[PDB]
Amino acid sequence: RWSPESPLQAPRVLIALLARNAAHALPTTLGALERLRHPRERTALWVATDHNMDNTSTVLREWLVAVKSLYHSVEWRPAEEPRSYPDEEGPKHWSDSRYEHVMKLRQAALKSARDMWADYILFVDADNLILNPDTLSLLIAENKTVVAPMLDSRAAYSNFWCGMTSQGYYKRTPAYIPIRKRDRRGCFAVPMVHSTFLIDLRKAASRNLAFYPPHPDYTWSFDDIIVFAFSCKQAEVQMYVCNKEEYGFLPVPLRAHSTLQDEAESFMHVQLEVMVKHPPAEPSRFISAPTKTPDKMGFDEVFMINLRRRQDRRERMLRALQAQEIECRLVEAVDGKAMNTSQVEALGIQMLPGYRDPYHGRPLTKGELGCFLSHYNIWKEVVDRGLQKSLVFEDDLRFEIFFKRRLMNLMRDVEREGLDWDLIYVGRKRMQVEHPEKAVPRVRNLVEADYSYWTLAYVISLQGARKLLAAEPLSKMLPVDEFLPVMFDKHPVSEYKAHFSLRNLHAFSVEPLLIYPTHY
Amino acid sequence: SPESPLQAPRVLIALLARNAAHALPTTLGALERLRHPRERTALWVATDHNMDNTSTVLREWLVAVKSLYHSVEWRPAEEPRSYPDEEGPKHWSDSRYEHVMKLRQAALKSARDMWADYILFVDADNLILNPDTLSLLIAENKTVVAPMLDSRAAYSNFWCGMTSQGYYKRTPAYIPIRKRDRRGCFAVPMVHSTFLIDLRKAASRNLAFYPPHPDYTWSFDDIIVFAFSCKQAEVQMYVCNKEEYGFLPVPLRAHSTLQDEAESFMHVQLEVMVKHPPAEPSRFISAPTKTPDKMGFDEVFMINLRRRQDRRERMLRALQAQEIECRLVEAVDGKAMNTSQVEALGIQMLPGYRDPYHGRPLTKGELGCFLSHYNIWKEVVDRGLQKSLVFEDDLRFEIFFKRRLMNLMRDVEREGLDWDLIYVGRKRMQVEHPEKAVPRVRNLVEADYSYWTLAYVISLQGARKLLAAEPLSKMLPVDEFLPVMFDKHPVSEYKAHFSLRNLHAFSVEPLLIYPTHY
Ligand SMILES: O=c1ccn([C@@H]2O[C@H](COP(=O)(O)OP(=O)(O)O[C@H]3O[C@H](CO)[C@H](O)[C@H](O)[C@H]3O)[C@@H](O)[C@H]2O)c(=O)[nH]1
Ligand SMILES: O=c1ccn([C@@H]2O[C@H](COP(=O)(O)OP(=O)(O)O[C@H]3O[C@H](CO)[C@H](O)[C@H](O)[C@H]3O)[C@@H](O)[C@H]2O)c(=O)[nH]1
Ligand SMILES: [Ca+2]
Ligand SMILES: [Ca+2]
Ligand SMILES: [Cl-]
Ligand SMILES: [Cl-]
Ligand SMILES: [Cl-]
Ligand SMILES: [Cl-]
Ligand SMILES: [Cl-]
Ligand SMILES: [Cl-]
Ligand code: NA
């Protein structure tokens, strides 16, 4: 008698989470873990927290109380005091006592996973955003003993090394950049993975892995990720990292003497990166992130040019600003194509005679016409309202880490040196690279702007806005990203600089650039 | 870059023990020796309503083995020692049925809560000889599968039919499965006692030992409730008989006794030693020492060729387990006698005998076999042994052999019966009609034509009658010489050579001893 058997239940996974000073990330992080597409009855939670200066243990307690019932079992290990290690130089410093405790904690979770007869233990760092809900399944599918998903960061940094130095140090190899950029996809044998990775406790070799104490043959630095990575060579467990698709993101780790506000803003920049091509990462339905309140960053006005039909750029940029606690006046761009040639003459507009595209030798486009007129209207509004220092934004740009603090301090430095300035490039395309641009003395992170090529974001002074309107550019219309290099007299073509008599613009660029385009 | 092997699946062995002290050294010994990794095994043990030291045996075993297993759960309950609504230790009152169903549901919840792959139920008196039974059952990849355990009778731990009312039902499938005629894993409506549940299967979630299913309307019986639970879960119960897995005592009536159980499980140990080495106990439990006696006979003999050590040790083991003590009579090797030593004894064959099957004359083995029985006959007369019991060395003891044989001799001597010979093991030849009953003495018949010498009781008056005929001059095979002496041999030529055939011979009925190999 043939009789069909019912399906096998999903593998049993223990999600082990260590949390110290992570209240900034838990709404986005724990919310992602809830929504993992793995049956919660085949999932268990293991949570350890201590040495907190923020309200990390409170947020965890409330999340766990909220989801305790959906899971197979929950383990809760808080420790309110002490709030910091007796041998630390700061919270972002990795002392040996901190290295030891975290090693003991991951061993504790590992033993905890073994004792409950789980199939897998998945480690997730508290600021590791596992955006893809299928990540756990895809990692279980590769059938590796220790496999990790390649999480994306703002820099080359990711949760894996391609080389190692026979003394445990990091090592570049030709394979890193290809894997990191998803040019080669697959699951690659690597000497080091960390942050988030999946251990398959079904494999016999997993019985020989340990996070603490180090292997008897260990002879390297007291460093948690090195100790575990060495446990894998001795167990002959090969570590793998996969990038076959996107899984999640993570912030670049700070230095020892970094602050918590550094870390908080770093994870906020992670949320920005996600929004470059994804919807904003949603929080848990039981945890709320604290209300933020924006400001103008000390400028007199913050503009953002946006064409009304570009709705999604608008919503993205306003989300990107809200999270940075930045507020702006939205300025509706002039649709150049919507201008019949009658309305073009009604404003006295004529192209700069004999203008050709620097790459296709073509005339001024209706699109560039509207772009110029949008900035021109902002210059007109600057003079009307007498705005001393205004910040101008276009609507398709990605922000650097610590954008607000880094910009507010250059303005404070420029002011304390009383620098006579008209225009400060916050984002541009530096066309003069063969020798460094002339550093501006006494003002850190500021150079004299040579030939540039964009208008993504700049700071304009009321003096500068007068100098630009003064040139009467409407009659000699030129792409605004070239009208400016003409005005600070660094444009290459001399024929163009002839049509403008008084080219007296003090133009400086922020160095390095704080704003880049989304698409490149 | 190769991946390491997967660990063995995770099994929880659930063990409900009540009044099992007679079995646990043997049963637990079998379990602790299963070929399946101990780290991939967990123990769940619950005991209560004990009248024997079951609690102490399990505790003694658990304390020893605890440190080798993934986990040990342990649920003892010393008081009360018996159910308030019971009629005896072998009575299954509703309170017992309810408590047992709850303990199995308790184990099923335990196996689930600990993320086990399988829960294995083994009753405390189920002997799992085959160490591969657990691995073999896991391999069949079923959701509820039981190994077919062997019993002394047609009983086993499965049914082939179940009525619309939940009652047992015979089908033509049962006997071939039971005898290992068909060897597979067969879908059946009932398995119990020892079976394996696959907790990896989504359907195993719907299984429950207690409470009964909402649609349940049958008797408040534990095995029925679980069987109906699989039905509602659309889980097919299977039983496999591909090889031998283990043995199992036949259950007893409600008004049965603890000693009936202890001796009935000893018969499993006996049935095991028929074709296997004896079933060893756990190396962490000591079995209770046994004090052998003589059963009231003046002597108990056991004929054994000195060369046949295998037979000797087996019989000695079988006798010790039954608390019976014997006098080993080294047999007479009829083949080792050169013709001159045959003549020294003055032995002539009965002129004309030929085997009723292949027609050969009397053999050398049949000679020494007669001389061994003959030499014991002399020793009964020598020592004045009123009643003695004679054993050969290749015979299979029935259940309750000791008490049943003692009780017969007791009814015999109470009725003052003029007896000479009592077959305990034989081959009955007259089978057309029943042999004659001996009034006022149950389980005893006047022996007609018989044809074996496995086991028999003999009296001093009988030992004299045999030696009186002086058979060494007219020697038949010893098993034909007796039906001559009590005047039933079909060959009147053979009965002619014996002038006086006055022997009073009887037979236990049914027989208490049978041959091992046929
Ligand atoms: O005393 C502590 C220190 C850290 N953590 C937790 O352990 C994880 C460490 O995260 P961090 O952001 O603080 O660490 P980094 O971003 O600096 O990157 C880390 O990546 C590895 C983590 O897998 C190693 O911890 C490595 O030493 C370290 O550089 C976090 O989940 C943190 O919350 C604790 O529970 N208790
Ligand atoms: O109060 C109790 C009653 C019983 N048991 C245990 O239950 C198992 C089965 O009981 P028995 O072996 O004494 O009874 P049976 O030999 O007759 O076989 C059983 O066959 C099925 C096996 O489950 C059913 O349990 C059925 O009720 C019962 O007859 C035994 O291991 C016994 O130790 C307990 O632990 N506590
Ligand atoms: Ca981190
Ligand atoms: Ca039984
Ligand atoms: Cl420093
Ligand atoms: Cl310092
Ligand atoms: Cl320093
Ligand atoms: Cl114990
Ligand atoms: Cl049979
Ligand atoms: Cl039955
Ligand atoms: Na420092």
Side-chain angles (χ1 to χ4, degrees), chain A residues 118-292:
Chain A
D119 289 308
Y120 294 90
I121 178 161
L122 174 77
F123 282 102
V124 190
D125 280 17
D127 57 5
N128 286 355
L129 176 51
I130 315 301
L131 212 55
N132 182 346
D134 300 324
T135 312
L136 172 44
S137 297
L138 302 168
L139 293 174
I140 295 181
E142 295 301 336
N143 196 29
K144 306 297 181 186
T145 305
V146 175
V147 61
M150 182 190 78
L151 306 179
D152 297 340
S153 78
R154 66 173 155 89
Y157 175 91
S158 185
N159 52 320
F160 75 100
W161 311 350
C162 272
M164 200 183 293
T165 62
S166 67
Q167 307 187 11
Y169 308 131
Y170 175 89
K171 181 182 180 177
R172 300 298 263 192
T173 81
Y176 189 87
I177 310 297
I179 302 177
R180 174 67 182 90
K181 279 191 178 173
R182 285 177 184 107
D183 286 352
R184 294 164 55 186
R185 299 182 180 261
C187 295
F188 306 90
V190 288
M192 165 72 69
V193 297
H194 55 85
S195 303
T196 61
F197 53 95
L198 180 80
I199 308 187
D200 184 350
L201 307 176
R202 306 171 314 126
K203 302 303 210 316
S206 69
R207 303 188 68 82
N208 295 317
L209 307 168
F211 293 97
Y212 194 81
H215 190 276
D217 299 328
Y218 189 73
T219 48
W220 293 338
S221 303
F222 197 77
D223 184 356
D224 57 358
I225 68 167
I226 305 181
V227 156
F228 182 61
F230 185 85
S231 196
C232 298
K233 280 161 198 178
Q234 310 307 286
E236 284 171 6
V237 177
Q238 174 56 60
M239 270 173 296
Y240 292 97
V241 55
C242 310
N243 63 349
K244 290 181 183 183
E245 40 188 300
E246 199 175 59
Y247 309 111
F249 303 83
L250 84 183
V252 171
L254 307 173
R255 309 176 183 180
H257 294 154
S258 301
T259 73
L260 294 190
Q261 178 188 356
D262 288 355
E263 186 70 50
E265 285 179 23
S266 190
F267 183 83
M268 173 269 319
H269 183 257
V270 180
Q271 300 171 304
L272 296 181
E273 293 296 285
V274 169
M275 292 184 302
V276 172
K277 288 178 182 180
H278 310 76
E282 304 299 331
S284 152
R285 49 197 168 273
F286 318 102
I287 294 175
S288 310
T291 305
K292 44 192 51 183

Side-chain angles (χ1 to χ4, degrees), chain A residues 295-334:
Chain A
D295 63 0
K296 289 287 183 64
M297 287 184 295
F299 293 101
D300 305 13
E301 185 64 288
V302 177
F303 300 96
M304 202 200 57
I305 312 169
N306 172 254
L307 177 63
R308 196 158 65 259
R309 73 175 189 240
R310 284 169 165 61
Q311 177 181 0
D312 285 351
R313 282 184 189 183
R314 184 169 58 248
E315 302 173 6
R316 192 194 82 99
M317 287 295 299
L318 298 171
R319 286 190 218 106
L321 290 177
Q322 188 199 1
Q324 296 177 103
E325 295 193 320
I326 299 172
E327 182 186 12
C328 82
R329 198 186 172 270
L330 177 67
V331 180
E332 279 202 356
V334 174

Side-chain angles (χ1 to χ4, degrees), chain B residues 15-33 50 52-54 57-58 61 90 122-128 247-249 258-259 261-269 279-282 285-288 290:
Chain B
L15 171 64
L16 321 193
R18 175 189 179 194
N19 297 317
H22 56 280
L24 288 174
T26 293
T27 285
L28 299 170
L31 292 178
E32 79 187 30
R33 288 192 290 262
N50 287 311
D52 55 1
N53 47 354
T54 298
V57 181
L58 285 166
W61 181 73
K90 297 314 167 185
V122 186
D123 278 6
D125 65 358
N126 290 194
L127 173 59
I128 311 303
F247 299 81
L248 203 172
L258 298 168
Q259 191 187 354
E261 191 75 35
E263 288 176 357
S264 175
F265 176 86
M266 175 210 60
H267 188 258
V268 173
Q269 325 194 252
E280 305 298 335
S282 168
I285 316 166
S286 50
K290 338 198 77 160

Side-chain angles (χ1 to χ4, degrees), chain B residues 363-423:
Chain B
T363 83
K364 280 180 171 177
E366 298 173 351
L367 159 67
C369 180
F370 194 103
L371 292 178
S372 296
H373 286 274
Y374 182 84
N375 292 339
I376 295 188
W377 299 341
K378 313 158 76 69
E379 184 177 337
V380 166
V381 185
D382 188 20
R383 288 169 59 202
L385 311 173
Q386 292 297 336
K387 49 175 174 167
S388 315
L389 165 74
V390 182
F391 280 150
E392 281 183 348
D393 54 3
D394 63 341
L395 45 89
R396 150 189 278 212
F397 293 92
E398 267 286 339
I399 186 176
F400 312 135
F401 168 81
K402 183 171 175 176
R403 298 188 304 180
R404 284 166 68 181
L405 178 56
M406 286 185 84
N407 287 343
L408 177 69
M409 303 303 304
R410 191 44 167 294
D411 293 1
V412 161
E413 74 202 14
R414 197 141 38 206
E415 298 289 335
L417 175 61
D418 182 16
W419 68 270
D420 295 327
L421 173 67
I422 304 179
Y423 282 111

Side-chain angles (χ1 to χ4, degrees), chain A residues 3 5-9 12 42 72 114-119 143 145 201-205 207 238 240, chain B residues 1 3-7 10-11 42 70 113-117 141-143 199-203 205 238:
Chain A
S3 191
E5 291 285 308
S6 68
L8 294 185
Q9 301 189 60
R12 290 145 292 195
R42 308 290 280 184
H72 177 255
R114 300 189 166 124
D115 289 349
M116 77 187 321
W117 263 350
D119 289 308
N143 196 29
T145 305
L201 307 176
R202 306 171 314 126
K203 302 303 210 316
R207 303 188 68 82
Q238 174 56 60
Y240 292 97
Chain B
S1 200
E3 292 289 316
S4 58
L6 294 184
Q7 303 191 56
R10 297 143 266 206
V11 180
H70 184 252
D113 288 338
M114 75 183 299
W115 269 351
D117 294 322
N141 187 21
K142 304 294 196 178
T143 297
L199 301 172
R200 310 166 315 135
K201 308 296 220 308
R205 291 172 54 194
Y238 290 86

Side-chain angles (χ1 to χ4, degrees), chain B residues 282-342:
Chain B
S282 168
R283 64 184 196 94
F284 319 103
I285 316 166
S286 50
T289 308
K290 338 198 77 160
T291 62
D293 71 340
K294 288 288 176 60
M295 296 174 290
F297 295 103
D298 301 2
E299 187 64 276
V300 180
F301 296 93
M302 208 253 279
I303 307 177
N304 170 244
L305 299 155
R306 185 192 51 118
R307 52 168 174 238
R308 306 310 174 181
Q309 311 188 1
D310 50 300
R311 293 186 163 191
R312 178 193 311 112
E313 307 165 18
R314 191 197 91 86
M315 292 295 304
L316 294 179
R317 290 176 168 282
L319 291 174
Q320 164 61 6
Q322 297 179 100
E323 294 209 327
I324 304 176
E325 173 173 4
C326 86
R327 173 172 185 165
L328 174 59
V329 177
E330 184 181 358
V332 181
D333 189 11
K335 300 180 180 182
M337 301 176 51
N338 59 47
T339 302
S340 298
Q341 295 167 354
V342 176

